[PDB]
Amino acid sequence: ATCDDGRTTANAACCILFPILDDIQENLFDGAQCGEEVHESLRLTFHDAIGFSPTLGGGGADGSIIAFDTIETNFPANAGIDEIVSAQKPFVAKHNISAGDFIQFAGAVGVSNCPGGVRIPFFLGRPDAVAASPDHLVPEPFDSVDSILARMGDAGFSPVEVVSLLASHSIAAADKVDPSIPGTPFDSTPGVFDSQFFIETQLKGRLFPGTADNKGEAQSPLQGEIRLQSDHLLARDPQTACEWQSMVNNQPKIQNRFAATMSKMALLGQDKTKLIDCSDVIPTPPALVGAAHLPAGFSLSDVEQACAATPFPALTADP
Ligand code: HEM
Ligand SMILES: C[As](C)(=O)[O-]
Ligand SMILES: [Ca+2]
Ligand SMILES: [Ca+2]
Ligand SMILES: [Fe+3]
Ligand SMILES: [Fe+3]
Ligand SMILES: [Fe+3]
Ligand SMILES: [Fe+3]
Ligand SMILES: [Fe+3]
Ligand SMILES: [Zn+2]
Ligand SMILES: [Zn+2]
Ligand SMILES: [Zn+2]
Ligand SMILES: [Zn+2]
Ligand SMILES: [Zn+2]
Ligand SMILES: [Zn+2]
Ligand SMILES: [Zn+2]
Ligand SMILES: [Zn+2]
C-alpha cells in the first residue's frame, strides 16, 4: 500500500502510523537518538505489559499504565515511571491510536534508533484498557531469582526468555535505585544495543558508584555503572547463568531473541490474529558499533564464571 505522502507499508491501515513516527522521533526521541526517552519508553513497555496474571488479573499490554496512571504510577515497583507516562500522554491524546498501541509503538521505534538494535514486530489495534493492573506484578531488583522467574513464568515467560528480555538492560539506566547518582547506566554503552551488559554484570564487583546501602543494588565493576542485585543474581544463579553467558559476544542471538520475546511481551493480553501487522513501519536500526570487550585494565580473571558446562569466552580489553 502507498500512503498519502508516498511512503509504503504492506497493510493500508498502518499508514496512520507515519505521522506518529515522525512526531515521536523528533519530539520524544530528540531527533531519533537512543537516549533517555528511548530507555524510559522501553521500560514502559514492560511495566505496561507485565501487569498480566491469570490468577490476579490485569490486561497486559493494554495501555493501563497510562489510562489508570493515578493508580499504577504509585505502585512501588513503578517508581520513576510517572515521568515517561506524563511525557507520552499528550502524544496519545493528539494522535488517534490507543494507549496500548502507542506504548508498544514508541518502544519499538525507540529501540530501532540504537546501534545494534532490532525491529520489534509491531501490531496495531489494541482496544483501550478496561482495568488497572494489580500491584505486585512488576519484578523488583531486590527480588530473588525464584521470585522473578515465578512472576515472569506466571505471565508466560520461561527462564531463557527472561534472560533474552534483559538484553534491554544494555540500553538502560537507573534514577531511583541510588538517587544520588541518577542516570547511571547498567552497561558502559547505554546508547548501543550490544552484549556489554552480559559481560559487565559477570565481572567481580568492586565499588558502589554512589552510596553503599541501597536496597536492590550490588557492587559495580566500574565507577560509571550501576549493578542491580537481580542482575547480579541472574548472571550467577544455576538456572540462568548458562543462558546469560551465551549472550556474550553473540550479537545475532541477542538480536533474534530480544525481538521475538519483545513481540511476545507486547502481545500479552492481546490476540495477534485480531490486530494488523505494521512491523514494516519501524525504522531500520543501525549496525552495531564496537565489539565485545572487557574494560580497560581488566582480564579474564576478573570474570566470575558461572556456567559449569562452558567456559567464559576469551575477550580482548579496551586499550
Ligand atoms: C526481570 C526483572 C527486571 C527487574 C528486576 C528490573 C529492574 C529495573 C530497575 C530497578 C530499573 C531502574 C529503575 C530506576 O531506578 O530508574 C530498570 C530500568 C530499566 N528496565 Fe529493567 N528490570 C527487569 C526487567 C526488564 C525488562 C523485561 C525490560 C524490557 C523492556 C526492562 C527494561 C528496562 C529499561 C530499558 C530500563 C531503563 C530505564 C531508564 O533508563 O530510565 N527491564 N529495570
Ligand atoms: C510478588 As512481587 C513481583 O511484588 O515481589
Ligand atoms: Ca498494562
Ligand atoms: Ca549497551
Ligand atoms: Fe490519568
Ligand atoms: Fe482512543
Ligand atoms: Fe479511546
Ligand atoms: Fe527519571
Ligand atoms: Fe569499553
Ligand atoms: Zn531528551
Ligand atoms: Zn527521564
Ligand atoms: Zn524522561
Ligand atoms: Zn495523528
Ligand atoms: Zn510485591
Ligand atoms: Zn518483590
Ligand atoms: Zn531514566
Ligand atoms: Zn536459584
Residue 96 belongs to some domain of the structure: yes
Closest CA to 118 of 133, 126, 108, 128: 108
Residue 1 belongs to some domain of the structure: no
19: exposed, middle or buried (Cβ count in 10 Å: 0-12, 13-18, 19+): middle
Cell 556489554 locates to 196
Region of residue 220 (phi > 0: left; psi between -120 and 50: alpha; otherwise: beta): beta
- Asked about 47 being catalytic, the answer comes back as yes
Do residues 43 and 174 share a domain? no
Do residues 166 and 110 share a domain? no
Residue 177 belongs to some domain of the structure: yes
Do residues 90 and 160 share a domain? no
Q: From atom 1 of ligand 2, which residue's Cα is the shortest distance away?
A: 136
Closest CA to 144 of 65, 231, 41: 231
Region of residue 216 (phi > 0: left; psi between -120 and 50: alpha; otherwise: beta): left
From the CB of 230, is ligand 1 less than 6 Å away?
yes
Residue 318 belongs to some domain of the structure: yes
Residue 260 has phi, psi (to 5 degrees) of: -70, -45
State how far the Cα of 273 lies from the Cα of 237, in Å rounded to an integer: 37
Residue 164 belongs to some domain of the structure: yes
Whether the CB-CB separation of 204 and 221 falls below 8 Å is answered with yes
State how far the Cα of 188 lies from the Cα of 186, in Å rounded to an integer: 7
CATH code for position 315:
1.10.420.10
From the CB of 110, is ligand 2 less than 6 Å away?
no
Closest CA to 124 of 150, 158, 157, 98: 98
C-alpha cell at 58: 490485569
State the DSSP H helix or E strand holding residue 255, giving kind and residue range, or none if neither: helix 251-266
Closest CA to 134 of 64, 86, 184: 64
Do residues 179 and 223 share a domain? yes
Alpha carbon dihedral 310, 166, 62, 216, in 10-degree steps, equals 120
Ligand 11 centroid to 36 CA: how many Å?
A: 6
Residue 72 has phi, psi (to 5 degrees) of: -70, -35
CA contacts within 13 A on the Cβ side of 264? 16
Do residues 68 and 113 share a domain? yes
Do residues 298 and 224 share a domain? yes
Cell 508466560 locates to 156
Closest CA to 74 of 3, 147, 134, 26: 134
Do residues 298 and 199 share a domain? yes
State how far the Cα of 199 lies from the Cα of 187, in Å rounded to an integer: 9
C-alpha cell at 272: 495477534
State how far the Cα of 169 lies from the Cα of 176, in Å rounded to an integer: 15
Do residues 165 and 233 share a domain? yes
Residue 6 belongs to some domain of the structure: no
Do residues 166 and 302 share a domain? yes
Ligand 17 centroid to 151 CA: how many Å?
A: 14
Alpha carbon dihedral 28, 34, 39, 45, in 10-degree steps, equals 70
List, in sequence order, the alpha helices (H) in 50-98. 64-67, 69-72, 81-94
CATH code for position 93:
1.10.520.10
Closest CA to 143 of 28, 43, 37, 232: 232
Do residues 169 and 101 share a domain? no
Closest CA to 137 of 228, 83, 76: 76
State how far the Cα of 206 lies from the Cα of 62, in Å rounded to an integer: 41
Do residues 308 and 185 share a domain? yes
State how far the Cα of 34 lies from the Cα of 49, in Å rounded to an integer: 22
State how far the Cα of 117 lies from the Cα of 254, in Å rounded to an integer: 9
Region of residue 297 (phi > 0: left; psi between -120 and 50: alpha; otherwise: beta): left
Do residues 165 and 121 share a domain? no
Nominal resolution in Å?
1.0
Q: Give how many domains the chain has, as a whole number.
A: 2
From the CB of 139, is ligand 2 less than 6 Å away?
yes
State the DSSP H helix or E strand holding residue 27, giving kind and residue range, or none if neither: helix 17-27
Residue 74 has phi, psi (to 5 degrees) of: -90, -5
Residue 17 belongs to some domain of the structure: yes
Domain ranges, residue 283: 11-138+262-289
Residue 5 belongs to some domain of the structure: no
State how far the Cα of 254 lies from the Cα of 128, in Å rounded to an integer: 32
State the DSSP H helix or E strand holding residue 124, giving kind and residue range, or none if neither: strand 123-124
State how far the Cα of 39 lies from the Cα of 41, in Å rounded to an integer: 6
